[PDB]
Design a protein around this ligand. Structure first.
Ligand SMILES: COc1ccc(-c2cc3ncsc3c(O[C@H](C)[C@H]3CNC(=O)C3)n2)cc1OC
Length: 277
């Protein structure tokens, strides 16, 4: 959990940023092997304690998670700034990857979004809400291995509640948010199912931004009229049907991740069967 700064080598180049911090590539000297890592650091000229708490809360969520489809935390270190050391997903965000690799097949996309549903089925069983589930947060280890990242807005649900009630609205990724998040500030695993539907749309659209050219308020007004984004070009009908099911307005009738992962699992095997024929 607490790492040694002398065993960490950071490269100067920045990969990008999350809800909090900036990610740099590094190397960590493990018990024997050297491990390539992604290190989230803080740009905090003012020495604001809030920036440190946000990164530590993020580290606290990751420490409790252990799944093949979730980015693993190696540990933390307090040096030039607080640093959250994670495993490295070399290929990066799924939306940026697909934008640059249009040859990726529908079979390959189903495989990757199914892997995201396995990680989310795990997160839901663990009673954590992601709250920022989007293609930009799905990181590729390989073209055939996706992992969920950025737990900056994530919350451990209370033992007596199935949702997190936000106190402050903030800079919210509204285009990925369910109507109950917008209308009641209530975040559940079912709210994450809604974001997963938007993520699926982004994946089948080869990383295109959802609701293009629309303001957040126009998206809310569209969804309220019962309108949904159209089927992406070349997206299988079974996959567009599943996105629409994720976009069930009423939180009670919306499927949970166990039902979502099963649909994708069965569809993926049908496509694997089609390919062999
Ligand atoms: C080819 O380009 C890239 C290759 C790898 C990365 C990369 C690898 C990586 N591994 C672990 S966290 C991580 C990460 O973080 C991101 C900056 C955000 C997503 N989630 C967060 O928390 C922050 N980015 C990024 C790339 O370009 C944007």
């Amino acid at each position: 959990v607490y790492l040694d700064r002398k065993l960490l080598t950071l490269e100067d180049k920045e990969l990008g940023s999350g809800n909090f911090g900036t990610v740099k590539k590094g190397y960590y000297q493990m018990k024997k092997v050297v491990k390539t890592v992604a290190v989230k650091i803080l740009k905090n000229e003012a020495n604001d304690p809030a920036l440190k708490d946000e990164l530590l809360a993020e580290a606290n969520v990751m420490q409790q998670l252990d799944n093949p489809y979730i980015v693993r935390m190696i540990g933390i270190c307090e040096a030039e700034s607080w640093m959250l050391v994670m495993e490295m997903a070399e290929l990066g965000p799924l939306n940026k990857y697909l934008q640059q690799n249009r040859h990726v097949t529908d079979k390959n996309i189903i495989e990757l979004v199914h892997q995201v549903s396995m990680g989310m089925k795990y997160l839901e069983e663990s009673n954590f809400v992601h709250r920022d589930l989007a293609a930009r947060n799905v990181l590729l280890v390989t073209q055939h291995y996706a992992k969920i990242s950025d737990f900056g807005l994530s919350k451990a649900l209370r033992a007596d509640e199935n949702y997190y009630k936000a106190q402050t609205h903030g800079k919210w990724p509204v285009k990925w948010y369910a109507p109950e998040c917008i209308n009641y500030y209530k975040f559940s695993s079912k709210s994450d199912v809604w974001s997963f539907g938007v993520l699926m749309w982004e994946a089948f659209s080869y990383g295109q931004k959802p609701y293009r050219g629309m303001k957040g308020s126009e998206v809310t007004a569209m969804l309220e009229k019962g309108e949904r984004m159209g089927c992406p070009a070349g997206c299988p009908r079974e996959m567009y049907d599943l996105m629409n099911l994720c976009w069930t307005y009423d939180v009670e009738n919306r499927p949970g991740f166990a039902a979502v992962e099963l649909r994708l699992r069965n569809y993926y095997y049908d496509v694997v069967n089609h390919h062999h024929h």
